[model samples]
Target: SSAATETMENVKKCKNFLSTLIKLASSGKQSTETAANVKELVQNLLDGKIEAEDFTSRLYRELNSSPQPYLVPFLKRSLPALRQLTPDSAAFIQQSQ
Candidate 1:
């Protein structure tokens, strides 16, 4: 189950990163409804209301639903945090788009 454990660890890391991101987005120029929704989605992940796979799918769907330029800054801030995850997990996210 080592591979599963690694995936779980990566999910935890991503969830923790998202916790800080919610605060950053609210305080900075990234303040928008889209960001708020993203934060809510991330919160759901943290709360274990949604699985990582569902979170990934929902997140990208939300992001690409329209032309949301404001989300660019949020995503930019997010990438570094994601880099803390294992290479495979980070790549999974990057390859989603």
Candidate 2:
């Protein structure tokens, strides 16, 4: 698939998975799953399979549901679009992810 296609696919999949994990976490049955989904969401963004806005939105959703207070700093710093990032630069990473 093309890079744009891949990015959207990741967003959809990650959003669905993370939402499910959030539900699990809310019930106190799978606390770890919340952190796991956040990690996966972050990794997917860094890997270029997901975009900043999509991941950022998910992070906020997770925060609203099951706040990982410690992770906010790292995520706040990481979620912005990098200074020089371009589609060409991220295309390969997107493909690999």
Candidate 3:
């Protein structure tokens, strides 16, 4: 029961971040600005300055507040490149979540 609850919590959190990022990336106001913000957020994440828990928490908040699509997949692909820009890159599992 505990494990199931933890997993559901994690999924809810992840979905929120995914939604928020999709909106930000899709927004036409200024792609550069949104990209920069996301870059900074992710950089903080890779550097370990921010814990995954904290990052997920805030990210979920943003995602929950937005409604956007197309940009979601674009970001899914963009992430590896963004991580590559820094020294600590994420390891991929090549499997769906």
Candidate 4:
């Protein structure tokens, strides 16, 4: 299988996660600001503008700040899953609950 094709599939998972993340944290400027930045970076990831190591570290850090109360439960899931974003895999969702 082509490696690039495999990774693109995994990154699609991030889009589902990101959209839900945005609405949940859509409380104010700061949270939405972070949302914009992270989403653009994800765009870079898809456009082949970023490398795996660079993309993961930057995005993981982008979301690493404390903000809203509603986000805590979400961050719990996302933070763990963020590190898993780079790999080529079949059972990616299995890494979480």
| Model 1 residue pairs with clashes | none
Compute the lDDT of residue 91 as modeled in candidate 2.
48
TM-score top scorer: 1
Q: Residues 59-88, candidate 2: write the lDDT tens digits.
A: 778657555554444433433433123234
lDDT of 3 at 84: 50
Inter-residue clash pairs, candidate 3:
20-63
How should the candidates be ordered by lDDT, best one leading? 1, 2, 4, 3
Give the alpha carbon lDDT tens digit for every residue of 6-85 in model 4: 55554455546645444444435557678667656554544446655565567667878444444334433343345455
Query: What's the true lDDT of residue 51 in model 4?
Result: 51
Measured against the true structure, the TM-scores of the candidates, in listed sequence, are 0.42, 0.37, 0.35, 0.41
lDDT of 1 by residue, 36-84 (tens): 6776776555444666556666777766644445544444444444444
Off by over 4 Å in 4: 1-30, 65-97
How many pairs in model 1 have backbone atoms within 3 A of each other, for residues 3 or more apart or on separate chains, i.e. clashes? 0
Off by over 4 Å in 2: 1-30, 65-97
Distance from true location, Cα of 48 in model 4, Å: 0.6
Q: Which is the winner by lDDT between candidate 2 and candidate 3?
A: 2
